[PDB]
Amino acid sequence: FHQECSLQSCTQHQPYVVDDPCPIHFYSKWYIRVGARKSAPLIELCVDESPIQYIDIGNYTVSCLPFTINCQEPKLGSLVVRCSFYEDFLEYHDVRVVLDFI
Amino acid sequence: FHQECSLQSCTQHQPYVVDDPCPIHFYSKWYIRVGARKSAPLIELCVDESPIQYIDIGNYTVSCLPFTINCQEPKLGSLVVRCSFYEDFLEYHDVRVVLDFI
Amino acid sequence: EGKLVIWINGDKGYNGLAEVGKKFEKDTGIKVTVEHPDKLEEKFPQVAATGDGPDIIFWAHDRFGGYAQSGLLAEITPAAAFQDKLYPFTWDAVRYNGKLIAYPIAVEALSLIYNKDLLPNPPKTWEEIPALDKELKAKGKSALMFNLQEPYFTWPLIAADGGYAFKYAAGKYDIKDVGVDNAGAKAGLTFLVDLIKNKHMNADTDYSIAEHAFNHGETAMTINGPWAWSNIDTSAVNYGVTVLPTFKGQPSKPFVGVLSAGINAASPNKELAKEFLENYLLTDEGLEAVNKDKPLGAVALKSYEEELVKDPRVAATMENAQKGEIMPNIPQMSAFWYAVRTAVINAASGRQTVDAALAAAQTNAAA
Amino acid sequence: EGKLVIWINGDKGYNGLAEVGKKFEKDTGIKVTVEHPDKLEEKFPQVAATGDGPDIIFWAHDRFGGYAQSGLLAEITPAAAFQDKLYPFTWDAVRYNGKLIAYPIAVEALSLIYNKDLLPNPPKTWEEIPALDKELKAKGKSALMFNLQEPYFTWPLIAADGGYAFKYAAGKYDIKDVGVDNAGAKAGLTFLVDLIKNKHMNADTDYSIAEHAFNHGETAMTINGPWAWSNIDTSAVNYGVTVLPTFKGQPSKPFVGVLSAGINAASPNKELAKEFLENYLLTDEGLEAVNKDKPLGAVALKSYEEELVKDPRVAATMENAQKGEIMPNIPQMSAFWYAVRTAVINAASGRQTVDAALAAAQTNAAA
Numbered sequence: 001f002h003q004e005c006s007l008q009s010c011t012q013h014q015p016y017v018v019d020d021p022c023p024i025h026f027y028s029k030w031y032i033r034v035g036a037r038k039s040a041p042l043i044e045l046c047v048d049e050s051p052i053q054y055i056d057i058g059n060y061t062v063s064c065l066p067f068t069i070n071c072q073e074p075k076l077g078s079l080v081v082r083c084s085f086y087e088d089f090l091e092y093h094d095v096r097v098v099l100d101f102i
Numbered sequence: 103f104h105q106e107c108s109l110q111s112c113t114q115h116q117p118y119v120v121d122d123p124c125p126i127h128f129y130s131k132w133y134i135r136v137g138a139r140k141s142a143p144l145i146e147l148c149v150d151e152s153p154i155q156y157i158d159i160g161n162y163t164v165s166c167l168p169f170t171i172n173c174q175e176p177k178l179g180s181l182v183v184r185c186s187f188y189e190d191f192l193e194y195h196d197v198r199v200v201l202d203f204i
Numbered sequence: 205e206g207k208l209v210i211w212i213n214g215d216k217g218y219n220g221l222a223e224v225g226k227k228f229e230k231d232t233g234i235k236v237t238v239e240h241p242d243k244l245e246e247k248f249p250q251v252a253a254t255g256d257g258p259d260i261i262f263w264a265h266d267r268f269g270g271y272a273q274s275g276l277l278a279e280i281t282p283a284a285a286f287q288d289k290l291y292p293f294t295w296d297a298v299r300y301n302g303k304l305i306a307y308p309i310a311v312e313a314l315s316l317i318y319n320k321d322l323l324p325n326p327p328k329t330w331e332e333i334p335a336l337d338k339e340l341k342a343k344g345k346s347a348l349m350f351n352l353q354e355p356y357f358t359w360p361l362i363a364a365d366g367g368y369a370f371k372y373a374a375g376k377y378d379i380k381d382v383g384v385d386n387a388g389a390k391a392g393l394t395f396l397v398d399l400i401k402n403k404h405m406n407a408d409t410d411y412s413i414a415e416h417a418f419n420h421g422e423t424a425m426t427i428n429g430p431w432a433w434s435n436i437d438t439s440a441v442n443y444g445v446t447v448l449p450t451f452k453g454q455p456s457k458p459f460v461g462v463l464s465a466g467i468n469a470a471s472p473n474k475e476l477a478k479e480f481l482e483n484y485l486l487t488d489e490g491l492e493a494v495n496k497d498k499p500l501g502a503v504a505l506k507s508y509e510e511e512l513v514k515d516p517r518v519a520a521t522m523e524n525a526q527k528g529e530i531m532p533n534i535p536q537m538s539a540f541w542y543a544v545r546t547a548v549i550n551a552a553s554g555r556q557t558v559d560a561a562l563a564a565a566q567t568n569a570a571a
Numbered sequence: 572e573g574k575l576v577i578w579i580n581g582d583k584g585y586n587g588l589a590e591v592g593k594k595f596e597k598d599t600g601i602k603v604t605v606e607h608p609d610k611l612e613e614k615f616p617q618v619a620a621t622g623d624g625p626d627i628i629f630w631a632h633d634r635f636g637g638y639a640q641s642g643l644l645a646e647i648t649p650a651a652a653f654q655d656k657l658y659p660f661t662w663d664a665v666r667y668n669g670k671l672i673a674y675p676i677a678v679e680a681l682s683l684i685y686n687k688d689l690l691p692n693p694p695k696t697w698e699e700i701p702a703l704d705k706e707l708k709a710k711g712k713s714a715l716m717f718n719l720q721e722p723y724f725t726w727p728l729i730a731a732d733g734g735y736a737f738k739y740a741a742g743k744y745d746i747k748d749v750g751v752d753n754a755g756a757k758a759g760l761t762f763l764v765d766l767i768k769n770k771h772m773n774a775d776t777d778y779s780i781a782e783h784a785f786n787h788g789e790t791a792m793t794i795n796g797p798w799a800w801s802n803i804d805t806s807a808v809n810y811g812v813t814v815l816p817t818f819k820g821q822p823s824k825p826f827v828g829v830l831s832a833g834i835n836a837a838s839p840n841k842e843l844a845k846e847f848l849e850n851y852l853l854t855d856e857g858l859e860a861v862n863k864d865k866p867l868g869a870v871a872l873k874s875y876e877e878e879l880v881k882d883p884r885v886a887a888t889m890e891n892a893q894k895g896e897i898m899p900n901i902p903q904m905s906a907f908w909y910a911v912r913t914a915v916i917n918a919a920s921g922r923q924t925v926d927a928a929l930a931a932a933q934t935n936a937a938a
């Protein structure tokens with residue numbers, strides 16, 4: 001069974017390598033769900049490959065590999081990782097990442 | 103720069119989830135190099151997909167996902183993981199895993 | 205669009221299906237195009253996730269729940285009079301979250317296939333196959349070869365003494381109740397691993413090797429389904445199709461697959477697809493054209509199945525299906541399939557013991 | 572086998588290459604087959620790792636070091652008289668660990684391409700493109716569109732003020748000496764990101780969008796190579812090919828690619844492939860047939876390049892090549908390319924700042 005939520009601890013406003021909640025043999029892709037509203041769109045934080053538009057994410061994403069953020073709640077909405085099974089991209093689940101500041 | 107060797111610690115003869123030395127965005131596939139001789143063949147420990155033959159690996163491999171061994175030196179040879187880049191399987195490097203027993 | 209595009213596997217009778225498509229074209233002017241691309245079960249979700257692809261895809265029902273969770277399949281609502289023309293359990297196999305999402309066509313189950321000339325009395329038990337292989341080896345033959353690379357083919361033996369995929373309880377499948385590492389699965393897989401250690405089977409036997417061996421009289425038995433009958437027919441091996449052997453007194457429990465016709469959610473010809481499937485294909489004459497090209501085995505249309513069951517191969521398919529289990533269609537079947545596939549092959553080739561392989565596969569599949 | 576199979580990209584003159592193949596067939600009876608599959612640079616290592624594939628593959632030299640480290644390419648040993656017919660730096664681009672592993676054919680570098688009717692005096696500096704876009708926007712046009720999705724196209728600006736891939740020192744490339752996050756790369760990428768924030772470019776512009784815009788008179792400039800000339804030719808846009816604009820007073824430094832012909836290590840026609848490449852293709856008449864079909868730009872055969880350089884498009888290609896950098900061919904180019912591609916697109920689309928994107932790409936590419 002896969003958790004829906006992932007509660008993690010980091011020092012605010014400093015780099016933080018996010019602990020990946022996706023299981024082994026699942027691909028991780030990180031998004032922001034606008035306004036944390038499930039009916040709102042997903043903004044991809046790491047453009048791999050479908051209209052791409054400029055959105056200022058600011059200082060949020062330090063690196064995409066490994067996924068590293070400046071430890072903070074995103075202004076645009078909630079942080080979400082989609083976990084997609086290696087053998088079948090139709091088997092997927094979303095984990096919301098929530099930060100407790102040290 | 104990628105290390106050639108990976109020295110790890112586990113309690114002998116007990117399950118141990120191997121710390122994966124492959125970088126993020128590299129695929130990990132685990133082998134035994136027969137007799138630790140570089141000119142000898144590689145035996146795959148986790149058959150994904152080329153003639154497959156029965157070889158008794160015994161109790162060595164507890165699980166392939168995540169890669170978990172009964173903590174011991176393999177009888178057949180050295181433990182090797184091949185790290186293959188996601189975007190290009192021709193960019194690869196091997197890491198030898200060596201165990202210090204607690 | 206005003207046109208019907210259909211995707212179906214290449215080992216099935218696509219020329220007969222096109223004949224049903226020609227007749228549909230004579231009655232409506234709508235051209236029906238039948239294609240058999242490789243890896244449709246992979247190609248379709250790829251092209252249908254972008255809103256493209258064929259109007260109708262034919263595939264085993266277990267994949268369609270993953271399709272429906274991503275909204276790739278149109279919901280169908282056939283009239284009650286039409287639903288009654290098909291066996292009720294087939295409709296259950298194509299229901300996802302309360303919605304019917306495809307039309308059942310054929311009911312597939314693995315059977316034992318044996319060379320009548322080498323083996324006129326095929327064995328009733330798995331337990332006597334080692335001694336039979338020992339005998340045939342002194343003649344340069346073998347008793348049994350079948351595809352060890354796909355867990356669909358090893359599941360009948362694995363499930364016979366207690367194994368199961370996802371438990372069905374209270375109208376739903378429980379993701380956390382998986383039965384691949386219980387005592388019956390361990391005993392089933394141990395028997396198969398023992399066949400390999402005692403050199404009655406090779407760990408690298410796949411679909412092609414097992415088919416070539418049986419179709420050329422080199423092995424006395426194989427385990428396959430109706431899609432394989434055509435190649436044995438032209439091979440001039442004198443063969444029979446019978447009930448799978450028992451294990452520890454229990455019947456082999458093959459997975460039951462319902463070959464089903466799903467309509468693309470992005471299709472603009474939804475009503476023409478429903479018209480073609482109900483009033484042209486799912487009839488005695490429509491199914492006969494497809495079956496005449498390449499046999500379907502048993503079918504979901506009861507009126508034509510009552511005709512096909514006279515064929516003893518289809519009768520054996522029915523009997524094996526009655527002793528088996530319907531495949532779940534939940535999206536976690538992909539992680540289930542991968543878990544069991546890796547465990548069987550790792551145990552077959554000596555990479556893991558049976559207990560270790562099944563325990564780890566249990567943990568992953570139930571995750 | 573007694574036959575020659577050749578793989579070359581589809582945007583190049585494969586019909587002219589087949590004419591050189593017909594003539595080879597008239598002289599030797601060996602049929603020469605030319606194919607243009609999609610994703611050859613991916614298809615070849617796949618099929619050649621299993622010992623199969625074409626006899627000859629045409630691709631930019633930077634991929635061939637990854638081929639040679641896995642032994643996919645045959646070593647070539649041309650006579651010294653033949654080596655002298657090609658510019659020495661091209662032989663350096665197809666040398667891996669001391670071995671020549673392909674035949675140079677063409678020398679590729681990006682150039683500025685401009686619409687003569689919209690823009691008869693194309694700008695000499697990057698810095699004046701914003702004001703030129705502001706002007707053309709009041710006419711419903713734009714100044715510049717080029718493929719932002721591939722870092723090959725942004726590298727000329729990134730490297731102009733100090734950026735570099737892998738440093739060449741003591742006859743080898745240093746995996747740990749990468750220059751994508753120095754001051755010149757940061758300033759180059761910041762200028763491009765500013766073009767997007769000020770709405771002079773869109774972050775989703777790719778190869779197709781930029782080509783369609785320029786070829787239909789909608790934008791005044793684009794940045795491309797000789798493979799794109801044919802489509803502009805039939806488009807009836809009156810265009811010129813000139814030197815890339817400077818940035819902060821420094822020339823743009825495009826990556827220089829040597830289109831090269833490598834021989835499959837698993838080929839049984841190795842001597843026929845060497846015969847075809849040396850004595851038939853790498854001649855004035857052989858290169859002319861290919862160039863006549865679709866222009867190669869500049870070429871590595873000095874005798875025919877002295878003829879092509881009369882074309883001002885080829886002259887501009889040479890000048891841009893002289894100001895650029897030869898691509899390294901080491902296998903880590905794949906991680907380099909992916910690192911720079913992700914950083915440029917993330918900075919272009921606002922996902923990362925320039926400093927953060929380049930710093931992280933530096934760490935990964937130098938790993």
Ligand SMILES: OC[C@H]1O[C@H](O[C@H]2[C@H](O)[C@@H](O)[C@@H](O)O[C@@H]2CO)[C@H](O)[C@@H](O)[C@@H]1O
Binds near residue numbers: 266267312354431
């Ligand atoms: O082995 C897992 C595999 O089993 C089933 O595939 C069957 C299919 O249903 C039959 O029609 C026939 O083609 O044999 C196949 C086994 O190779 C599942 O339908 C499939 O999803 C699953 O991967």
Ligand SMILES: OC[C@H]1O[C@H](O[C@H]2[C@H](O)[C@@H](O)[C@@H](O)O[C@@H]2CO)[C@H](O)[C@@H](O)[C@@H]1O
Binds near residue numbers: 798
């Ligand atoms: O963007 C990275 C890419 O750059 C080069 O590809 C060039 C190629 O050399 C040209 O002939 C033409 O096709 O444009 C390509 C850019 O899309 C490298 O050769 C290639 O390996 C690399 O991925």
Ligand SMILES: *[C@@H]1O[C@H](CO)[C@@H](O)[C@H](O)[C@H]1NC(C)=O
Binds near residue numbers: 013014059060070
């Ligand atoms: C990132 O930007 C936010 C702006 O809301 C700021 O609060 C935070 O301190 C910044 N973190 C840095 C610069 O590391």
Ligand SMILES: *[C@@H]1O[C@H](CO)[C@@H](O)[C@H](O)[C@H]1NC(C)=O
Binds near residue numbers: 115
């Ligand atoms: C695994 O087998 C080896 C045999 O050499 C043995 O030494 C070890 O104790 C075993 N570990 C177990 C059973 O956990």
Ligand SMILES: N=C(NO)NCC[C@H](N)C(=O)O
Binds near residue numbers: 042084089090253274
């Ligand atoms: N960015 C998105 N969706 O909006 N990705 C969706 C991927 C998802 N697993 C699918 O195939 O349905």
Ligand SMILES: N=C(NO)NCC[C@H](N)C(=O)O
Binds near residue numbers: 186192194620641
């Ligand atoms: N099992 C093996 N080799 O023996 N795998 C080799 C994979 C390797 N990276 C290659 O493509 O060359």
